Design a binder for this molecule. Sequence first.
Ligand SMILES: CNc1ccc(-c2ccc(/C=C/c3nc4ccc(OC[C@@H](O)CF)cc4s3)nc2)cn1
Ligand SMILES: CNc1ccc(-c2ccc(/C=C/c3nc4ccc(OC[C@@H](O)CF)cc4s3)nc2)cn1
Ligand SMILES: CNc1ccc(-c2ccc(/C=C/c3nc4ccc(OC[C@@H](O)CF)cc4s3)nc2)cn1
Ligand SMILES: CNc1ccc(-c2ccc(/C=C/c3nc4ccc(OC[C@@H](O)CF)cc4s3)nc2)cn1
Ligand SMILES: CNc1ccc(-c2ccc(/C=C/c3nc4ccc(OC[C@@H](O)CF)cc4s3)nc2)cn1
Ligand SMILES: CNc1ccc(-c2ccc(/C=C/c3nc4ccc(OC[C@@H](O)CF)cc4s3)nc2)cn1
Ligand SMILES: CNc1ccc(-c2ccc(/C=C/c3nc4ccc(OC[C@@H](O)CF)cc4s3)nc2)cn1
Ligand SMILES: CNc1ccc(-c2ccc(/C=C/c3nc4ccc(OC[C@@H](O)CF)cc4s3)nc2)cn1
Ligand SMILES: CNc1ccc(-c2ccc(/C=C/c3nc4ccc(OC[C@@H](O)CF)cc4s3)nc2)cn1
Ligand SMILES: CNc1ccc(-c2ccc(/C=C/c3nc4ccc(OC[C@@H](O)CF)cc4s3)nc2)cn1
Ligand SMILES: CNc1ccc(-c2ccc(/C=C/c3nc4ccc(OC[C@@H](O)CF)cc4s3)nc2)cn1
Ligand SMILES: CNc1ccc(-c2ccc(/C=C/c3nc4ccc(OC[C@@H](O)CF)cc4s3)nc2)cn1
Lengths: 62, 62, 62, 62, 62, 62, 62, 62, 62, 62, 62, 62
Amino acid sequence: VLYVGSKTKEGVVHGVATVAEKTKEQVTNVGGAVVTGVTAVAQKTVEGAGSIAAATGFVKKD
Amino acid sequence: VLYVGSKTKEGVVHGVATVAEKTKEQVTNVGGAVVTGVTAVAQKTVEGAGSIAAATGFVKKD
Amino acid sequence: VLYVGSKTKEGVVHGVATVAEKTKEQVTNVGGAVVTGVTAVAQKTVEGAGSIAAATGFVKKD
Amino acid sequence: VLYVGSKTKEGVVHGVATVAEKTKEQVTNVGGAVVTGVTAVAQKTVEGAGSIAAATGFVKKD
Amino acid sequence: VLYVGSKTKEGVVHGVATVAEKTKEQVTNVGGAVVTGVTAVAQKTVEGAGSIAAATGFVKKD
Amino acid sequence: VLYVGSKTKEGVVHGVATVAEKTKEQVTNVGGAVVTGVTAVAQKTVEGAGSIAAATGFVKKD
Amino acid sequence: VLYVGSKTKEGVVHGVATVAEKTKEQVTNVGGAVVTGVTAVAQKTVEGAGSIAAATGFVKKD
Amino acid sequence: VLYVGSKTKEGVVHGVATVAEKTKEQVTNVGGAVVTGVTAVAQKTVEGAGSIAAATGFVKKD
Amino acid sequence: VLYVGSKTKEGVVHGVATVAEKTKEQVTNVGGAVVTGVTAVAQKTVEGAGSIAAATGFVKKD
Amino acid sequence: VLYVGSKTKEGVVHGVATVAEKTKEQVTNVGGAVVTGVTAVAQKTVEGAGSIAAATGFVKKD
Amino acid sequence: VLYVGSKTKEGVVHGVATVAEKTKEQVTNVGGAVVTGVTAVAQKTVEGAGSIAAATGFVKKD
Amino acid sequence: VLYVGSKTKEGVVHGVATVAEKTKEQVTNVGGAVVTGVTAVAQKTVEGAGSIAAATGFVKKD
Ligand SMILES: CNc1ccc(-c2ccc(/C=C/c3nc4ccc(OC[C@@H](O)CF)cc4s3)nc2)cn1
Ligand SMILES: CNc1ccc(-c2ccc(/C=C/c3nc4ccc(OC[C@@H](O)CF)cc4s3)nc2)cn1
Ligand SMILES: CNc1ccc(-c2ccc(/C=C/c3nc4ccc(OC[C@@H](O)CF)cc4s3)nc2)cn1
Ligand SMILES: CNc1ccc(-c2ccc(/C=C/c3nc4ccc(OC[C@@H](O)CF)cc4s3)nc2)cn1
Ligand SMILES: CNc1ccc(-c2ccc(/C=C/c3nc4ccc(OC[C@@H](O)CF)cc4s3)nc2)cn1
Ligand SMILES: CNc1ccc(-c2ccc(/C=C/c3nc4ccc(OC[C@@H](O)CF)cc4s3)nc2)cn1
Ligand SMILES: CNc1ccc(-c2ccc(/C=C/c3nc4ccc(OC[C@@H](O)CF)cc4s3)nc2)cn1
Ligand SMILES: CNc1ccc(-c2ccc(/C=C/c3nc4ccc(OC[C@@H](O)CF)cc4s3)nc2)cn1
Ligand SMILES: CNc1ccc(-c2ccc(/C=C/c3nc4ccc(OC[C@@H](O)CF)cc4s3)nc2)cn1
Ligand SMILES: CNc1ccc(-c2ccc(/C=C/c3nc4ccc(OC[C@@H](O)CF)cc4s3)nc2)cn1
Ligand SMILES: CNc1ccc(-c2ccc(/C=C/c3nc4ccc(OC[C@@H](O)CF)cc4s3)nc2)cn1
Ligand SMILES: CNc1ccc(-c2ccc(/C=C/c3nc4ccc(OC[C@@H](O)CF)cc4s3)nc2)cn1
């Protein structure tokens, strides 16, 4: 009997349970960038810029 | 009997349980960058800028 | 009998339980950068700037 | 019988339990950078600037 | 019987329990940088500036 | 029977229990940097400036 | 304008969120009465014995 | 404008959030009565014996 | 403008948040009555014996 | 403008937040009555014996 | 403007926050009655014997 | 402007915060009645014997 092994995890989400009970959810945006309600998001990136739930406005390079 | 092994975890979220009971959730944005309600987010990045729930406005390079 | 092993954890969130009972949650943003409500977020970064729930305005390089 | 092993933890959050019972939560931002409500956030960074819940305004390089 | 091992912890938060019962929580920001409500945050950084719940305004390099 | 081992801790927070019962919590900021409500935060940094709950205004390099 | 009304609740459960992460859940019963794992149960009874999650053994009337 | 009304609650449970992370949960019963794991249970009873999570053994009336 | 009203509560539980992190939870019962793990339970009873999480053994009426 | 009203509470539990981090929780019962782990329980009773987390053994009426 | 009103409370528990970090919690009972771990329990009783966390053994009426 | 009102409290517990860090908590009972760990318990009783955390053994009426 040997039983050799390994179990890994990299950017793993497991076991979430959520409840949301809003009554009036409004969003008003003029020229900006809104991000809302992200939940249970997993990612893995190699040799790149990983980024979750980011926001930017007015990227004016000149 | 040997029983050789290993279990790892890297940027792992597990076992969350959330409740939100708002009655009037408003968001007003003019030219900015709003980020709201991020929950249970896991990530792993290699040779890159990892960033979760970031915000910026008016990136004017000139 | 040997029983050789190892279990590690790197940027791990596990076992959260949250309750939020707001009645009127408002956000007003003009030209800035707002970040709200981050919860249960895990990350790991190698050779990069890791950053969670950051905010900046008016990045004017000239 | 040997029983050789090791269990480590690096930037680990586990066992949080939170309750928030606000009645009127307002945020007003003009040109700045607000960060609110961060909870149960774990991170690990290698050869990079780690930073959680940071804020800056008016980064004017000229 | 040997029983050789080791368990470590580096930047670990575990066992928090919080209650907040505000009735009117307001925040007004003009050009600054506000940071509020950080709780149960763990981090580890190697060869980088670690920083939790920092704030700065008016970074004017000229 | 040997029983050889070691358990360490470095920047570890465990066993907090908090209650906050404010009725009217206001914050007004104009051009400065406010930091409020940090709780149960652990960190470890190697070859970098660690800093928790810091604030600065008007970093004018010229 | 009148706006006359009323909203009631009698034995009402609303807004639960649960997570269970057992690894080996065993139950052995010999002649008894086991009750396990009741969750989010609401009831209303008029002129009768209401009873939730009850147990009895050996009801020997002679 | 009148705005006449009323909102009541009688045996009401709302806003629970639970996490259970057992590894080996055993129950052994011989002739008794076990009750385990009741959570978020609401009831209302009129002219009757209300009873939640009760246990009895050996009800021998002779 | 009148604004006449009333909001009541009778046996109401709201806003609980729990975490349990056992590793080996055993229960052994022989002829008795065990009750465990009751949480967030609300009740209302009129003209009856209300009773939550009660236990009895050996009810021998002769 | 009148603003006439009233808000009452009778046997109300609200705002609990709990953490339990046992490693080996055992219970052994022989002929008795054990009650454990009651938390956040509210009740109201009219013309009846209210009783929470009670225990009795050997009720031998003869 | 009148602003007539009243807010009462009768057997109300609100704002608890608890942490328990046992390592080996044992209970052994033979013929008795044990009660353990009651927390955040509210009750109201009218024309009846209210009683929380009571214990009795050997009720032998003859 | 009148501002007539009244706010009362009767058997009310609010604002507790507890920490318990035992390592080996044992209880052995033979024929008696043990009561342990009561915390944050509120009650109100009218025309009845109120009693919290009571214990009795050997109630032998003959
Ligand atoms: C600073 N923090 C750190 C630093 C380092 C670590 C760390 C480093 C290395 C490892 C290696 C884990 C391995 N597990 C197995 C399992 C089976 C196997 O099979 C071999 C094949 O020949 C079949 F027999 C080969 C391997 S290697 N784990 C954790 C964690 N945290
Ligand atoms: C800093 N954090 C870190 C750092 C390192 C690690 C880390 C590094 C290496 C490993 C390797 C895991 C392996 N498992 C097996 C299983 C079977 C196998 O089969 C071989 C084939 O010949 C059939 F026998 C070969 C292999 S290699 N795991 C984790 C984790 N975390
Ligand atoms: C500063 N903080 C730190 C610093 C260092 C560490 C740290 C460093 C190294 C390790 C290595 C862990 C390993 N586990 C196994 C399991 C099986 C295996 O299998 C071999 C294969 O031949 C089959 F037999 C090979 C390996 S290597 N763990 C933690 C943690 N924290
Ligand atoms: C300043 N703070 C610090 C500093 C250092 C540390 C630290 C450093 C090293 C380690 C190494 C841990 C290891 N565990 C195993 C388990 C099995 C294994 O298997 C080998 C394979 O051949 C199969 F047999 C190899 C290894 S190495 N842990 C913690 C923590 N904190
Ligand atoms: C200033 N504060 C400090 C400073 C130093 C430390 C510190 C430094 C080193 C360590 C090393 C811990 C190790 N644990 C194992 C377990 C198994 C194993 O397996 C070997 C493999 O051959 C299988 F047998 C190898 C190793 S190394 N721990 C803590 C903590 N705090
Ligand atoms: C100024 N304050 C300070 C200064 C120093 C320290 C300090 C320094 C070193 C250590 C080392 C701890 C170790 N633990 C093990 C366990 C098993 C093992 O396994 C070996 C492998 O061959 C299998 F057998 C190797 C090692 S090394 N701990 C604390 C703390 N505080
Ligand atoms: C000891 N604790 C206690 C004791 C008593 C109470 C309690 C008693 C009575 C009430 C009555 C509430 C009513 N609400 C409305 C709304 C509209 C309506 O419409 C009428 C129709 O003609 C249209 F206009 C008639 C009615 S009656 N509420 C609470 C609570 N708690
Ligand atoms: C001890 N606790 C207690 C005790 C009493 C109460 C309680 C008692 C009575 C009520 C009555 C509520 C009513 N609502 C309406 C709405 C419209 C309506 O329309 C009439 C039709 O003519 C059209 F206009 C008639 C009615 S009656 N509510 C609560 C609660 N809790
Ligand atoms: C010892 N503790 C106690 C004791 C007593 C109480 C208690 C007793 C009575 C009440 C009555 C509440 C009412 N609310 C309304 C609302 C509208 C309405 O509408 C009428 C219809 O004509 C339309 F206009 C009629 C009614 S009656 N509330 C609390 C609480 N706690
Ligand atoms: C010893 N401790 C105690 C003792 C007594 C009390 C206690 C007793 C009575 C009350 C009554 C509360 C009422 N609220 C309203 C609201 C509207 C309404 O509407 C009328 C309808 O005509 C529309 F306009 C009628 C009523 S009666 N509250 C508390 C509390 N605690
Ligand atoms: C020994 N300790 C004690 C003793 C006594 C008390 C106690 C006794 C009575 C009360 C009564 C409270 C009331 N509140 C309202 C509100 C509106 C309303 O509306 C009327 C309707 O006509 C619409 F306008 C009628 C009523 S009665 N409160 C506390 C507390 N503690
Ligand atoms: C020995 N210790 C003691 C003894 C006595 C007391 C005690 C006794 C009586 C009270 C009464 C409180 C009342 N509050 C209101 C509010 C509004 C209302 O509205 C009327 C309706 O007509 C609308 F306008 C009627 C009433 S009665 N409070 C405390 C406390 N402690």
